[PDB]
Design an enzyme around this catalytic site. Structure first.
Site, PDB file in Angstrom:
ATOM      1  N   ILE A 193      93.534 -11.015 -10.868  1.00  0.00           N
ATOM      2  CA  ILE A 193      92.959 -10.855 -12.191  1.00  0.00           C
ATOM      3  C   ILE A 193      92.035  -9.646 -12.141  1.00  0.00           C
ATOM      4  O   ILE A 193      91.604  -9.209 -11.071  1.00  0.00           O
ATOM      5  CB  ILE A 193      92.200 -12.127 -12.637  1.00  0.00           C
ATOM      6  CG1 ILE A 193      93.130 -13.340 -12.616  1.00  0.00           C
ATOM      7  CG2 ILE A 193      91.682 -11.979 -14.051  1.00  0.00           C
ATOM      8  CD1 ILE A 193      93.145 -14.065 -11.300  1.00  0.00           C
ATOM      9  N   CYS A 194      91.732  -9.082 -13.308  1.00  0.00           N
ATOM     10  CA  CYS A 194      90.798  -7.964 -13.432  1.00  0.00           C
ATOM     11  C   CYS A 194      89.814  -8.202 -14.574  1.00  0.00           C
ATOM     12  O   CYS A 194      89.636  -7.364 -15.460  1.00  0.00           O
ATOM     13  CB  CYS A 194      91.548  -6.649 -13.622  1.00  0.00           C
ATOM     14  SG  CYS A 194      92.162  -5.937 -12.085  1.00  0.00           S
ATOM     15  N   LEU A 195      89.162  -9.360 -14.579  1.00  0.00           N
ATOM     16  CA  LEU A 195      88.099  -9.594 -15.546  1.00  0.00           C
ATOM     17  C   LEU A 195      86.912  -8.690 -15.248  1.00  0.00           C
ATOM     18  O   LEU A 195      86.604  -8.407 -14.089  1.00  0.00           O
ATOM     19  CB  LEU A 195      87.636 -11.049 -15.512  1.00  0.00           C
ATOM     20  CG  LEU A 195      88.670 -12.153 -15.711  1.00  0.00           C
ATOM     21  CD1 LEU A 195      87.990 -13.456 -16.092  1.00  0.00           C
ATOM     22  CD2 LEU A 195      89.708 -11.755 -16.738  1.00  0.00           C
ATOM     23  N   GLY A 211      91.416  -6.110 -18.494  1.00  0.00           N
ATOM     24  CA  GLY A 211      91.441  -5.176 -17.385  1.00  0.00           C
ATOM     25  C   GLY A 211      92.845  -4.839 -16.930  1.00  0.00           C
ATOM     26  O   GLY A 211      93.040  -4.241 -15.874  1.00  0.00           O
TER      27      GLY A 211
END
Lengths: 148, 365, 76, 146, 76
Positions: free
Chosen positions: D83-85, E76
């Site tokens: 994930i890229c929160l 993102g």
């Protein structure tokens, strides 16, 4: 029935169009569905085009290859047979064999082949582990930015 | 092949005949396998591999990123196709992981419980296979291209360690003493190897094109200094007796221990006699290498004609040791190959490359 | 012990089980008080899909240990 | 710290979040496994996507490395399950607890942002044609989540 | 009627709301209850953002329900 096929492929690739003209591409689709040896004849036509020195022509050949790949299965086996050379001619991985001009068409070729290889890894990776090897090699050894 | 079966059945030919002929047939038909895979775990390239000597079950691998995977080559599944799952791993999270590339991982001979490794962090660690904890660590003053333990010595447990200094180091896995050094080389020592036959004969290859066999019991230099022309161009040993024209970065005694194969950056192999250092003039053609560290390669065992599997650019080359013919060229990799290791039990070949892959080649049919 | 099997909607179904009941028993108890037969449950306890042969003591299920129930409409 | 993780584990066992569930996988309390049931009224309906949390040695003041184990179709989640929160890399806040990061991920399953996407290949499909997105995500859920 | 919301600090607070009420006022009630700015809340119900320009009745919210409060995030 090879004359018309060589012709049609030649008008498709030599035109340098930004996008594949639809109806003659549909003729290619039909007449490539006609026979398997002649599908592979189209594959040799694509391979011979891809070595030739022009980025737009290589782009047209690669987009035809992607059409047949997403459309044909024996084409997937046949192309994974020499995926190494396919990557050398598309991605320009080897510094001793870069991509011809123009720069815009070469950049579009790089983007399109990166995204097509992503799609192929997602869709046919498990059925063709050599495609998985090529994808992994591109993603780490060559460090191809798939997010670009 | 039914002929061999009948001949063995009626006692005509010794069973040895069928065994060796079939092993040679399998090695001649060697090919990459999509009916087998090895899990991808190394961030960078694979620099080394060493199947365990006894039972040929486990398999280490020294990644260029400092991770030491420990595979398991037994098809524990039920399907025809399987992947060699990685049992353990000295990951970067491990407290005592190697900080830089691991370029030699070798099992402690006669004891699979331990295994050793060494890296450009100037360290050689003795790993415990069970708990994965460093039993002993030796810190050197300079990097460690390659090290090797005697696969035959039941008496000593010394460990030749070829650092990039000109002096071969001998580390003792028993009561620690790296004091013993073998002087006589002039530049870095890119590949060492103990003699599989004699306990105390150590062959060390350097980057100044010299291959020397050391009787480590002797403390007054080396027994032999290999020379290309067998003394034809005789010159005193101050700038002569060069086993190659460029760096020599690979050694592998034949299985019997009677011959010392050497490969160097001048793009040639040479099958040197291991008792008097006389080149036997086996041609081998031109073999391509350009690596600047220890090039690993191995030689088949239990086959009619001994084969040698040398990393050749990005491909494994299969030559016949005693005739020099080129059997074939295994071709499945995407970057230069750094290490291929032969699974003697089943005639299988595992070849780690720089593209993070470990391709397991197996015979066809 | 009591396990309260709370589903997506937040309804908190109460259940009672002995410490050694096999999870098939848990699903069956849920059937009685909620009505979904055991084929269509997928009980998730603390981020581990419970397997239909393990005993409840395997997962360290205690009094008032809330499970999660999720419907598998196919459910064979 | 462990005591923070202990308190989180206890207060999660007592009052669990609705469609979330996380607990240690084994002896090591720093390695949890979680589970995000697919939010209702979404292509992920009826799905059960397993995460894999990893708490650092200073967990209150440093985010946990959560990563999907069940291959999820999402512009913001790569095929590797990462994930890229922003909350999880840059704007980590100690006040945010694991019951909250899991719920925020659950909410973001339905609220992607193809702008600055971790997977541009899917981001283009999402931005252009959302009708096909809700079918490809549905089939991925059916072939991985159920 | 009223509604439950689970603040970030572990506590839980009850909000007196009506279905016609918009989410902006809900966030303002969260503010004057504990004071995190209207922008930073991100209310979650059944894993859904509670959009600012909407009302509870839009999201099918009833009595004794629960809303989850988190910190504002992004893609993102």
């Amino acid at each position: 029935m090879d004359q018309k096929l060589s012709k049609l492929v030649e008008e498709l690739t030599t035109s340098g169009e930004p996008r594949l003209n639809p109806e003659k591409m549909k003729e290619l689709k039909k007449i490539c569905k006609s026979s398997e040896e002649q599908l592979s004849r189209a594959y040799r036509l694509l391979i011979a085009q891809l070595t030739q020195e022009h980025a737009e022509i290589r782009l047209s050949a690669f987009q035809i290859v992607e059409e047949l790949f997403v459309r044909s299965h024996q084409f997937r086996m046949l192309v994974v047979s020499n995926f190494q050379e396919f990557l050398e001619l598309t991605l320009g991985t080897d510094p001793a064999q870069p991509l011809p001009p123009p720069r815009e068409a070469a950049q579009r070729l790089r983007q399109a082949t990166t995204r097509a290889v992503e799609g192929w890894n997602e869709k046919f990776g498990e059925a063709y582990k050599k495609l998985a090897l090529g994808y992994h090699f591109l993603r780490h050894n060559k460090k191809v930015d798939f997010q670009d | 092949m039914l002929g061999f079966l009948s001949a063995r059945q009626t006692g005509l030919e010794d069973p040895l005949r069928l065994r060796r002929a079939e092993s040679t047939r399998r090695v001649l038909g060697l090919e990459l396998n999509k009916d087998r895979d090895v899990e991808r775990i190394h961030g960078g390239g694979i620099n080394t591999l060493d199947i365990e000597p006894v039972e040929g079950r486990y398999m280490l691998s020294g990644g260029s990123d400092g991770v030491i995977v420990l595979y398991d080559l037994e098809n524990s599944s039920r399907q025809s196709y399987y992947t060699c799952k990685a049992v353990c791993s000295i990951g970067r999270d491990h407290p005592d992981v190697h900080r830089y590339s691991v370029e030699t991982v070798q099992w402690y001979p006669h004891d699979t419980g331990m295994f050793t490794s060494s890296s450009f962090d100037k360290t050689l660690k003795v790993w415990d296979t069970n708990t994965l904890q460093t039993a002993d660590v030796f810190n050197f003053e300079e990097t460690v291209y390659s090290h090797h333990m005697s696969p035959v010595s039941t008496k000593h447990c010394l460990v030749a360690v070829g650092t990039r200094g000109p002096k071969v180091q001998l580390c003792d896995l028993k009561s620690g003493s790296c004091s013993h050094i073998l002087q006589g080389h002039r530049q870095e020592i890119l590949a060492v190897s103990w003699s599989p036959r004699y306990d105390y004969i150590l062959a060390t290859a350097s980057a100044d094109s010299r291959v020397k066999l050391w009787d480590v019991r002797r403390a007054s230099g080396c027994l032999i200094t290999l020379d290309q022309h067998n003394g034809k161009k005789s010159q005193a040993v101050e700038s002569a007796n060069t086993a190659h024209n460029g760096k020599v970065n690979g050694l592998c005694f034949t299985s019997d221990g009677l011959h010392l194969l050497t490969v160097g950056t001048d793009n040639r192999m040479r099958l040197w006699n291991s008792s008097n250092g006389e080149n036997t003039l086996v041609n081998y053609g031109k073999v391509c290498n350009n690596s600047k560290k220890g090039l690993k390669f191995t030689v088949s065992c239990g086959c009619s004609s001994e084969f040698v599997f040398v990393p050749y650019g990005s491909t494994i080359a299969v030559y016949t040791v005693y005739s020099g013919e080129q059997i074939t060229m295994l071709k499945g990799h995407y970057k230069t190959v750094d290490c291929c290791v032969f699974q003697s039990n089943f005639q299988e070949l595992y070849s780690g490359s720089r593209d993070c892959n470990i391709l397991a080649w197996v015979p066809s049919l | 012990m009591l396990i309260k099997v709370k589903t997506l909607t937040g309804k908190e179904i109460e259940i009672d089980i002995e410490p050694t009941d096999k999870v098939e028993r848990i699903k069956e108890r849920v059937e009685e008080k909620e009505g979904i037969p055991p084929q269509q449950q997928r009980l998730i306890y603390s981020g581990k899909q419970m397997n239909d042969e393990k005993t409840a003591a395997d997962y360290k299920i205690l009094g008032g240990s809330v499970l999660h129930l999720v419907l598998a409409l196919r459910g064979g | 710290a462990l005591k923070r993780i202990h308190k989180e584990l206890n207060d999660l066992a007592r009052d669990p979040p609705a469609q979330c569930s996380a607990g240690p996988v084994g002896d090591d309390m720093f390695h949890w496994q979680a589970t995000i049931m697919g939010p209702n009224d979404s292509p992920y309906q009826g799905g059960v996507f397993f995460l894999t949390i990893h708490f650092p040695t200073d967990y209150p003041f440093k985010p946990p490395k959560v990563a999907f184990t069940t291959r999820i179709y999402h512009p913001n989640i790569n095929s590797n399950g990462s994930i890229c929160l922003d909350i999880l890399r840059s704007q980590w806040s100690p006040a945010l607890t694991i019951s909250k990061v899991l719920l925020s991920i659950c909410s973001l399953l339905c609220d992607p942002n193809p702008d600055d996407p971790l997977v541009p290949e899917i981001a283009r499909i999402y931005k252009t044609d959302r009708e096909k997105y809700n079918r490809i995500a549905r089939e991925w859920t059916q072939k991985y989540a159920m | 009627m009223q509604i439950f919301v689970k603040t970030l600090t572990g506590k839980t607070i009850t909000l007196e709301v009506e279905p016609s009420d918009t989410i902006e006022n809900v966030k303002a009630k969260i503010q004057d209850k504990e004071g995190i700015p209207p922008d930073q809340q991100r209310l979650i119900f059944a894993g859904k953002q509670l959009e600012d320009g909407r009302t509870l009745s839009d999201y099918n919210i009833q009595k004794e329900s629960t809303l989850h409060l988190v910190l504002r995030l992004r893609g993102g």
